Amino acid sequence: DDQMTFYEAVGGEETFTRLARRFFEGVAADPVLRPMFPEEDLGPAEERLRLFLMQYWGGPETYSERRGHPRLRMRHEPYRIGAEERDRFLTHMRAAVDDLALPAHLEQQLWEYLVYAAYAMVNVPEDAQ
Amino acid sequence: DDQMTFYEAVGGEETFTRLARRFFEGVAADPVLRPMFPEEDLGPAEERLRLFLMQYWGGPETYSERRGHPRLRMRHEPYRIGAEERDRFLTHMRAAVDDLALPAHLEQQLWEYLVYAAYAMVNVPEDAQ
Ligand code: HEM
Ligand code: HEM
């Protein structure tokens, strides 16, 4: 038969719209991570992740066309990101993923990227690589 | 990113192995359809559907290499297939699909084929086409 991108497979945009929602929802409820972002009305940050992930899994290039070529740890250098940090991020991401209730194969693929991507992002001298 | 077949998307063989299981399980429990197949030990029929559907969604060509080019209503001409029949088949297929609990997009694609394919298969002069 025909072939498809992960984006279309996990059911397209609404999926990612949902993922980021249940994510920041928990981020809101987290003390250390509420601080992490300055001020309030930080619902546009939600849009970014959303647009990025859409783009990563083979969706709309939208993210680039507003935020350019994704320089990830550049945009993460501003921040004091350590274990405690990442761990809490991931706990909100774990929660966010179970809510999508994907087939194990896809879920395994999505979650694994985000597990690396958050372990990668850590910038303080804590890790082994 | 990379692309994938529906087969791999819905998580490959175990998915289809499961689909046919919960299907024939209900077929077993159905009077009209238990008759439909002669004698007993009709668990190999389960294997066929399984192998076929695997093949259809972009899986292993296995089905052909044992049962040849799939001539569907040929292999269905032997049988007196009407509405009541198909309807009961579909009810076991509906049940079988909900158990996989797929994302709506994929589920919608799988189920829709099988909805047509069973409406197509009907051979008595009942339908509109
Ligand atoms: C290690 C845990 C992480 C923490 C503590 C964290 C936190 C942050 C912070 C504080 C910002 C800046 C706010 C903003 O730019 O609006 C940010 C931005 C961003 N993060 Fe993370 N993040 C983490 C991991 C990740 C991961 C794994 C991804 C990839 C899926 C990601 C994707 C992004 C994106 C796309 C932006 C916005 C960049 C832009 O377009 O300006 N972050 N994150
Ligand atoms: C309309 C309702 C249907 C009824 C009542 C029905 C019933 C049957 C019967 C009585 C047989 C013969 C048993 C056998 O060959 O072992 C059979 C065979 C088969 N059916 Fe159906 N069927 C229906 C729809 C479908 C559909 C929609 C598909 C496609 C997904 C399908 C796929 C097959 C396959 C692959 C075989 C075995 C052919 C072979 O390799 O010998 N059937 N079915």
Identify which ligand lies nearest to the alpha carbon of B41. Answer: 2
Do A5 and B1 count as a contact with CB atoms less than 8 A apart? Answer: yes
Residues of B in contact with A106 (CB under 8 A): 9, 11
User: For chain A, what are the domain ranges?
Assistant: 1-129
Coil, strand or helix at A86: helix
Coil, strand or helix at A123: coil
Distance CA A15, CA A19 (A): 6
For ligand 2, the distance from its centroid to the CA atom of residue A115, given in whole angstroms, is: 44
What DSSP designation does A73 have?
T
- Please say whether the beta carbons of A124 and A80 come within 8 A: yes
Do A9 and B9 count as a contact with CB atoms less than 8 A apart? Answer: yes
List the single residue in B4, B56, B101 with the smallest CB-CB distance to A9.
B4
Paired tokens of A114: 């985000």
Of A62, A18, A25, nearest in space to A43 by CA: A25
What resolution (Å)?
3.4
For ligand 1, the distance from its centroid to the CA atom of residue A76, given in whole angstroms, is: 6
| Structural element, H or E, at residue A81 | none
**Directed axis angle between helix B83-98 and helix B13-29, to 10°?**
130
Paired tokens of B25: 């399980």
Please give the full DSSP string across chain B, using - where no structure is assigned. --EEEHHHHTTSHHHHHHHHHHHHHHHHH-TTHHHHS-SS--HHHHHHHHHHHHHHTT--GGGHHHH-S--TTTTTTTS---HHHHHHHHHHHHHHHHTT---HHHHHHHHHHHHHHHHHH--STTS--
List the single residue in A1, A102, A103 with the smallest CB-CB distance to B5.
A1
CATH code assigned to A1-129:
1.10.490.10
Paired tokens of A32: 């250390």
Structure determined by: X-ray
Q: Is the dihedral of CA A105, A108, A113, A116 positive or negative?
A: negative
B102 touches chain A (CB under 8 A): yes
| Structural element, H or E, at residue A31 | none
**Most B CBs within 10 Å: which of A3, A6, A16, as the mutation test of the B interface?**
A3
Distance CA B128, CA B87 (A): 16
